[PDB]
Amino acid sequence: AMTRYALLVRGINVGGKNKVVMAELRQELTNLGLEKVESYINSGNIFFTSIDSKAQLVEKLETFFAVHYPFIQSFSLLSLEDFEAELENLPAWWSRDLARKDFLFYTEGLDVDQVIATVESLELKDEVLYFGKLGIFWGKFSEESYSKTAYHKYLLKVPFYRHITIRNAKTFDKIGQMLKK
Amino acid sequence: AMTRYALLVRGINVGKNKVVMAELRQELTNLGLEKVESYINSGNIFFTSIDSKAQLVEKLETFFAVHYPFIQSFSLLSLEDFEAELENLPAWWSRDLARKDFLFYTEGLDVDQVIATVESLELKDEVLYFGKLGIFWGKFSEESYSKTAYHKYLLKVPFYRHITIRNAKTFDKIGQMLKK
Amino acid sequence: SNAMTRYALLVRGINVGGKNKVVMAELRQELTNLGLEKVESYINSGNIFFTSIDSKAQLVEKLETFFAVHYPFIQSFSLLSLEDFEAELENLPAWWSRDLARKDFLFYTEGLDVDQVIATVESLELKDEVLYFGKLGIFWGKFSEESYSKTAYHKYLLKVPFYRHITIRNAKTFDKIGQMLKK
Amino acid sequence: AMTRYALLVRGINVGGKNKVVMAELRQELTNLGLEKVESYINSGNIFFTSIDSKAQLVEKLETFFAVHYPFIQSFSLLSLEDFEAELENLPAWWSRDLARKDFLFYTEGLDVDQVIATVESLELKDEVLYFGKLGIFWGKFSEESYSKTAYHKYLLKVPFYRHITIRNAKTFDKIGQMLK
Ligand SMILES: [Cl-]
Ligand SMILES: [Cl-]
Ligand SMILES: [Cl-]
Ligand SMILES: [Cl-]
Ligand SMILES: [Mg+2]
Ligand SMILES: [Mg+2]
16 A cells, blocks of 8 residues: 655765755655655655555665665655654653754664663763654753763764664654655 | 865873774764774874865864863864975974974964964074974984973973874874875 | 475575675575575565475575575575474563563574584573573573673674574564564 | 785783683684684684785774673784785894894784884894884894893883784794795
């Protein structure tokens, strides 16, 4: 059955490199046979519909990126049904006005249980996190204490850093909206 | 364009101020720098980037302030910068002086004030030349070394923690790593 | 022989450390040309599923000959049927479903002297861990990340002669293998 | 191409600790994917063949030792081709009947410029040394004068001591033959 997906990528359109023009990428994916292709902002949030199996889509996209955008070396790919399931188990604090709220989306092929063990080893300070099914909800309470959080101090040190796609809560919401189309 | 840089830091891996090179190289890779390499353990890092130098300096300052807060100055220079310096080496820089050091300037340094401070020192059995990236400073003899301004006065200057000192062999190694 | 049987073919050591490269789409096509049917793969670590009515002995010989020519770094493999796997599911340790820090299944490979593997494993001094010898391999649970580096699993498995002749999968992948076989 | 390497370590199998059982280590390295793994004596002379890049092999071995033999903090890793290049430039005195002939092999990551400056600072007596590509050839001529040599009196003082891997000339020769 036709399924809608969100395809999220990291590390693009920053530092004057890894350039991806959204209009071009939407056209490319349309030309590969993905339907109703849309995007949001410029960090790599792509939505499309397909009847192909998830495994087929992952192989297609891996092949496409390896040839045409080889700096895209990880991506998250999740369905409307996956996201709806996540929306049924949101932390109560996720809706509150914390200073910063980020969602760390897992990517295809990620060793999630190892990520969880690594995150669990960090000593958390003025922050709260919850392991969801598509990624990690991670809230930091205050701009006063932000620089002392494990999020701020240690994320660049973790082995999984380039293999997660990080978005703020505003974009997390928008991803859900765009999946419902 | 894609530019190769040397990032040099003072005061690490001595006494404390611990930095594991393999960790730093991976952290800088995560920060977005490419083809990150290091030489020995005193803080000689090489990377490629097409980002503007001003954005590189800001990213690195922010990075060190969180991850290695004892790194409170650094030198950042390009291959092109180094090659320009190599075209105006003092003739004495190639001779067997007892000691030869290069004092690399750091980002944000008030170079004109450094030059005024250094010119105020009474030199003895030594010669120095103000280059574009820093100061070439040769001391002729071990016998006379303890009477040199380099020995007697460098710890007395305000700019000491804001220069990165390397010996001549390491200065050459930095150029070779930039050219790789 | 006599019935169309669904098999899992598991290999170790591929697509890691910048070598031992196997492209899944290529392998699926090549095994289809070899005469295996409905060939599917899970992820990239070497988990292949196929259907065949050929005898297991002939399947093993054909696969050995195939790898020797096409992927000579594949020097052992596990080959098991849906029936085999369902039999293993009837005999899971009670702790295998619990929230241990790490759970792995060490799948035996074709031609392996299982009795030697058992004797070697039994010679190891276990610490914060538990293992059970199943039909298709060894269930091996490690209770905690804080004690993991003191386990025999961690300290000694690179020392054993059988290491390159078992195919290690985590419990989540063990489950996925069963799901892929049952399709 | 398949390349043969020698992997040399120091400080093992002495002083009642730092135990490495050669048969175990050979098996471990085989299990990591290294081929035709062999060893000589018990001081840490291992030989293996691989298609992996030198950089890949260094990282593989560093990671392995840090987890499984953390007292192996340095190592020498050199190819047949490296050794053959060294064999084209042997000192003429290396075949002569000196009382003692040793080779100080450099290790991965060693600050070789530092080592060279430190060694050059020593006052040599009845001995001769030559700086090769892979390390230092160091001959002591006579049993009667051995106790006055810098090799005997000063080597233990150097900061680099635990970061080089010392072999006698017999073992140096054997390393070459095991490389093929
Ligand atoms: Cl965002
Ligand atoms: Cl000043
Ligand atoms: Cl004087
Ligand atoms: Cl020896
Ligand atoms: Mg847990
Ligand atoms: Mg001769």
